[PDB]
A paper describes a structure:
Some Gram-negative bacteria target their competitors by exploiting the type VI secretion system to extrude toxic effector proteins. The opportunistic pathogen Serratia marcescens has recently been shown to utilize T6-dependent secretion of two family 4 amidases, Ssp1 and Ssp2, to mediate antibacterial activity. In S. marcescens, the resistance-associated proteins Rap1a and Rap2a neutralize Ssp1 and Ssp2, respectively.
The protein is a monomer in solution but crystallized with two molecules in the asymmetric unit, each consisting of residues 1–163. The primary, secondary and tertiary structure of Ssp1 classifies it into the NlpC/P60 cysteine peptidase superfamily. A short peptide segment links α6 to β3, which represents the start of the C-­terminal subdomain. This subdomain is dominated by a four-stranded antiparallel β-sheet with order β3–β7–β4–β5, which is flanked on one side by α7 and β6 and on the other by α6. A disulfide bond is observed between Cys146 at the C-­terminal end of β6 and Cys150 located on the loop linking β6 to β7. Cys50 donates a hydrogen bond to a water molecule, which in turn interacts with His133, Asn48 and Tyr129. Asp135 accepts a hydrogen bond from His133 and appears to complete a catalytic triad reminiscent of that observed in typical cysteine peptidases.
Author numbering:
A (entry chain A), B (entry chain B): 1 to 163
Amino acid sequence: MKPLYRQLKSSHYSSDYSSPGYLAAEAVYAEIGYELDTLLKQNPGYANTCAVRMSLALLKTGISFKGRLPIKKGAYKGKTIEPGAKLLADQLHRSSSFGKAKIFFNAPDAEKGIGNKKGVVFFNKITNYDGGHIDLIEPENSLLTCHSHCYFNCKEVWFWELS
Amino acid sequence: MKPLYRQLKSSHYSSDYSSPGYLAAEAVYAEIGYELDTLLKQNPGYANTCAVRMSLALLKTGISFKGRLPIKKGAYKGKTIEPGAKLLADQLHRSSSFGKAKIFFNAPDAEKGIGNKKGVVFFNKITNYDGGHIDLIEPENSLLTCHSHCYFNCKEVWFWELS
Ligand SMILES: [K+]
Ligand SMILES: [K+]
Ligand SMILES: [K+]
């Protein structure tokens, strides 16, 4: 299936405190049956929660993707999360659900390429930020807004349009 | 013609430790295929990195200018950086894209002249600071802030407004 933007957004926990769809990182992991503090000790990379949040939104809208972190609690117990942003972007890139991303190498090209569309965005190799960022993006007041945060100071912007 | 402020900013590496867009001098030069240590030995002036950073931001927003350091690596290989702040300011001043800067000769006139606008700023002949400083400036909580640092304690402030 191909998820609709509105429903993917409804099913996506934002990390932005002022977002209507906000949920704290600890609560996101608790839902899937993990203690964040425990995971951080195993791999500090778990502090970057964008791909966990996006994985969960995709699962909730019925989208297939390979994952590495088993869900241990709730309706999605047994299903898997991909906690790495790049690895999740790779999955989307090779999927029939989403197809190949449009990839932009500078800010003007990224903004023009996205234009008035909405969908999934992946900011790859962000300046002064570890692990990248995958999120939802849409126009707002003639600018682009991300459900959590945009990171246009990066090496590559990947975009998948949704309806 | 002129680049959009937000896109120029997204394309600009800050030298402010606290900036979300911070990249250290070593990494800046490494991107364009240079070793900072080597350049410093050729000319200690290379320690002032503001014009290299601004040069990169201009290239990434498709703005043409005369430079003197050929890029050896990446998307802009073959094109030049201008490492000198005054010389870069000269190029913008005579360009058809940016046009003539508004030039202020004291700090209060500069503050009032820039006001609540945003764009490119050049601080010429800064007290107790060698090489000048070219940067991005914008209001934040009704106070002007530079992407790296402001230096209003100088002989001349040049300003190009951007949208
Ligand atoms: K955030
Ligand atoms: K996040
Ligand atoms: K050039």
